[PDB]
Structure formats: structure tokens, C-alpha cells
């Protein structure tokens, strides 16, 4: 009966058969006014980049709020449509539920709320939203990894939050999932712990040479300036995936510091012929210009990389370096201040403002920014040396 149509629609959606999925979703929703079928049709609209139609679908009958799932789909549709006001409207400023084997529905809502606050540059509220999202359901990981990647929490705070959260939901997979999460934790704090975790995960389980473990090893080496292990791990993982975006920034920096101009050139060409839109490729081209001492030229290419992707520390930081290295010192201050304000939670912009202020022979403000950077990150040779 209707169940056969429902499963056929689900398979057609899963099989990337968009027309049949849309047709059958429409038919089943017309047959029965079941909001889950409406959610499915909205999902089909969502997949093929038809966001406004799904918005109007879930808006026309006011079925949002009846079930949380369609509300989340609708909010995601707005956030992709960048009508952040309406998305925050439907989701709410804070948790409305604050007092199956899958991720808790409420946790996803808090993640979306954190994402919209981040988009609105409201970092302080976004931090709380993401923390609540990860605390509510440990089954979630998008919020945890987003917070870690965007450096919205200090390493000590990151460790404290990791320790605060438990793993009771996982049960049998408690230790393996703890190690898996601990792979992605920030460095500069008790690195030996992340070490022993990655070896205990390496030999005991079949995950010996996976993408994330070698990524964490590369990050450790890059932090410790262990650059030959950096490279060897980087090529040994690159030979499998030639376009793994997770490792490309570290790889590019590591080539830059070895000044492998030629490998950098080949990577720039390969990435340009494949991913013109992504800012990573233009960052690679600009750092190729850097390796050839072309600050004035790749000034523009860092501008391009930064605009093609906001919330990218590397592009804007390099842009400020291009400002600072040769002359034009006055506005390097403004550039690094923009780095600090738009990228809170990272000690490096504050340290750079401090060292630049010392460079004008202006002392007390250099001290101020230096102590700010030290507050953000306690364990860094650069800040303490400065």
C-alpha cells in the first residue's frame, strides 16, 4: 500500500533519482497529510538546490513546530538561503527544550543555532551554543569539530570541555570513540597524551594509517617543527587522496618552509585545474608567489583566497604578513586588528599585533598584546620569546 510507495520514494532519493523521488513524495504527501512525508519532499527539494520551494512547502501549511525534524530542515534551508533572521526566528535564540540509536534531535538544533550565531559574527553566543550542543548529546560531533577547527575555545578550555563530557551513550565503543575524539583535540597541551592515544588506537584496531590519525601526526610534527616527518607523512597520505582538503593547509605551509618551489608549483597547477572555486588552490598559488619573493603580487591572491572563503585564518593571516614584511607599516596594524577581532580565540593575531607594536618601538601596547596572546595560549615558544 502506502508503505511500498514510501520505501520506493526513499530508495529513489537514496539512489539520486530526483524526479521519481519528488513525484512519489508529492503523491504520498497528497495521499496522507503526514508531516514526515512533507519532510521527505523538503529533503528532495533540498538536495537538488531548490531551497526556496522547500521553504514555501514547509511554510504554506504551518506544519513546522508540529514535529521538530521539519523545523530543523526548514531552518537549514534558510541558513543556506542566508536569511539568517528567519532561521534564528524559527529556531529560537536559545534552547527551547532546556529544563533510536541516532543523534538527538534537539542537539542538531543547538548546532544549527551555533552555526547561525557564528555566521552573524556573534562569537560569544556561538561558543555557548556549541558547548551546549556538544554537552546535550555526545553522539554529536559536528559541533565539537567545528569548535576545534575554528579555534573558538582556548586549548585549556578545549581540554576541560573534553574532560567534562562523558561517553556513557557509546557503551561498548567507549574507549575507541574517546580515542577517535581525542585525535582531533588541539595541541600545545600534554601532547604525550594525544600521542599514546594515537598509538593505542593504531595497533589495537585496524585504524593504523587512516586519514585523521596521519593528519594528527602531521599536525603534531608541524607544531613541533618536525618537518621531514611532516612531509613524509604528508606524501604518504596524499598518494591515496590527491585532494584531501583536511591536510592541504599543513602540507602547503610545510612545503613553503622547506621552499620546495617545484612541488608547490605542481600542486598549484593540479589544484587550479581541478578546484578553481575553493580558496585552498588560490592560497597555494599565492604562497608559491611568496616562495619566489612576490609579496606585492600575491597580496592580491591572499585577497582572493580570503574573499572566496571567509573564516579562514590562513588567508587573512598571510595577507597581514604581506602587509607587514615590506614597508606600508601603518595599515599592517589595521589588518592585524581585523584578524584579532574577526578571529577571536587565537593567540597568534594578538602576538602579531604585539610584535608589530614593538616594531614601531611602541612598547606598552606591545606588552598589552603580548600578554593577551599569552592569556589565549599558555604554551607557545613564539609568544614567550616575544
Amino acid at each position: 500500500a502506502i508503505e511500498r510507495l514510501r520505501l520506493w520514494r526513499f530508495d529513489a532519493l537514496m539512489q539520486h533519482m530526483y524526479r521519481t523521488a519528488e513525484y512519489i513524495a508529492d503523491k504520498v504527501y497528497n495521499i496522507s497529510n503526514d508531516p514526515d512525508d512533507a519532510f521527505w519532499l523538503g529533503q528532495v527539494y533540498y538536495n537538488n538546490n531548490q531551497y526556496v520551494r522547500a521553504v514555501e512547502l514547509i511554510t504554506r501549511n504551518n506544519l513546522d513546530g508540529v514535529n521538530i525534524l521539519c523545523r530543523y530542515l526548514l531552518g537549514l534551508s534558510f541558513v543556506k538561503l542566508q536569511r539568517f533572521d528567519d532561521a534564528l526566528d524559527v529556531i529560537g535564540e536559545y534552547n527551547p527544550f532546556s529544563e533510536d540509536g541516532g543523534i538527538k534531535m534537539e542537539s542538531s538544533l543547538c548546532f544549527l543555532r551555533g552555526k547561525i550565531y557564528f555566521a552573524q559574527n556573534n562569537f560569544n553566543k556561538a561558543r555557548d551554543a556549541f558547548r551546549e550542543a556538544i554537552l546535550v548529546d555526545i553522539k554529536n560531533f559536528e559541533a565539537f569539530e567545528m569548535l576545534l577547527s575554528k579555534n573558538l575555545l582556548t586549548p585549556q578550555e578545549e581540554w576541560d570541555l573534553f574532560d567534562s563530557l562523558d561517553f556513557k551513550e557509546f557503551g561498548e565503543d567507549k574507549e575507541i570513540m574517546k580515542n577517535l575524539y581525542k585525535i582531533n583535540l588541539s595541541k600545545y597541551i600534554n601532547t604525550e597524551d594525544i600521542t599514546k592515544s594515537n598509538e593505542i588506537l593504531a595497533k589495537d584496531y585496524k585504524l593504523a594509517d587512516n586519514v585523521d590519525v596521519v593528519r594528527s601526526k602531521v599536525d603534531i610534527c608541524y607544531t613541533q617543527c618536525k618537518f621531514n616527518e611532516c612531509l613524509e607523512l604528508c606524501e604518504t597520505v596524499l598518494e591515496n587522496d590527491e585532494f584531501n582538503t583536511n591536510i592541504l593547509p599543513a602540507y602547503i605551509g610545510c612545503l613553503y618552509e622547506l621552499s620546495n618551489k617545484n612541488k608547490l608549483f605542481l600542486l598549484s597547477h593540479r589544484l587550479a585545474e581541478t578546484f578553481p572555486k575553493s580558496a585552498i588552490t588560490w592560497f597555494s598559488v599565492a604562497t608559491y608567489y611568496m616562495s619566489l619573493d612576490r609579496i606585492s603580487e600575491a597580496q592580491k591572491y591572499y585577497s582572493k583566497s580570503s574573499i572566496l572563503d571567509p573564516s579562514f585564518a590562513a588567508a587573512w593571516l598571510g595577507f597581514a604578513h604581506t602587509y607587514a614584511l615590506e614597508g606600508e607599516q601603518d595599515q599592517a596594524l589595521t589588518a592585524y586588528s581585523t584578524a584579532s577581532r574577526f578571529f577571536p580565540g587565537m593567540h597568534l593575531p594578538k602576538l602579531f599585533l604585539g610584535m608589530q607594536f614593538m616594531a614601531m618601538n611602541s612598547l606598552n601596547l606591545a606588552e598589552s598584546y603580548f600578554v593577551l596572546a599569552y592569556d589565549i595560549c599558555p604554551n607557545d615558544p613564539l609568544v614567550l620569546n616575544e
Binding site: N62, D64, G65, D85, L88, D89, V90, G92, E93, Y94
Partner: protein, 129 residues
């Protein structure tokens, strides 16, 4: 829970606008009501109650179908009618009333002139327009 449905037909309003309207609405009523919630309450011989610039005596004469201190009384009286019972007049310094007074009638008289042709010439205005 505070009702916000009539302020926006969208059944959901983000919480920032909820207090934005709530704090806005209460003091707006508080100004009119005092020279609390909106949803709990909205409430509070010649028929004509008020006319701008019309005092109670001027209303009564309608129902019948009709030296420095003295000029200061006329000084304040003139601005009472034109400013619709504005409370800032009493806080104005006395010598600051004089220049505002002279600009009142001077501006007022200009309205009187504004409020108050050969055949060949005056036909052109309709042709050209």
C-alpha cells in the same frame, strides 16, 4: 505567555524582537497612559471633547455659538495653543521665549499671503501643460 501573533502574521517571532516589541509597547502606553501588559487591558452636553489648540474655555464659548507680566501670560498662551500643551515651555528661559514668539507670527503671517490675467496669455498655461 505574552501574545505576539497580531504584531506579525508569521506564527514565530525571534526572541530579540519579542522583548524589542514588549519593551517598546509598554513605555509607549506608559507615555499615553501616564503623562503591566497590553493583552490584559486596553481600556482607558457638547460631544466634541478636544480640538488642537482649544482649551476648555474655548470649548465652552463654542457651546454658546461664540504690563510685563500680562504679555508673558500672552507669551505662554500663544505657545500653549500652537505646541499642543507642550511641557517644555515652563523649562524654557524667559528671554528665549521672545525670539520664538517673533518667529511665530512672522512665519504665521507668511501663511496668510500663501493661503490668500489677459486672455491671450492665460490660454498658454493649458496648452503647455
Amino acid at each position: 505567555q505574552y501574545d505576539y501573533s497580531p504584531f506579525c502574521e508569521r506564527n514565530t517571532l525571534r526572541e530579540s524582537r519579542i522583548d524589542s516589541f514588549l519593551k517598546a509597547e509598554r513605555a509607549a502606553h506608559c507615555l499615553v497612559f501616564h503623562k503591566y501588559r497590553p493583552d490584559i487591558d486596553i481600556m482607558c452636553s457638547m460631544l466634541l471633547e478636544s480640538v488642537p489648540g482649544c482649551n476648555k474655555e474655548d470649548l465652552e464659548r463654542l457651546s454658546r455659538r461664540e504690563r510685563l507680566d500680562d504679555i508673558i501670560n500672552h507669551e505662554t498662551n500663544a505657545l500653549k495653543s500652537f505646541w499642543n500643551d507642550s511641557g517644555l515651555v515652563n523649562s524654557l528661559q524667559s528671554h528665549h521665549l521672545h525670539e520664538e514668539y517673533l518667529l511665530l507670527q512672522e512665519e504665521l503671517k507668511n501663511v496668510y499671503k500663501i493661503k490668500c490675467e489677459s486672455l491671450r496669455d492665460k490660454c498658454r498655461r493649458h496648452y503647455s501643460n
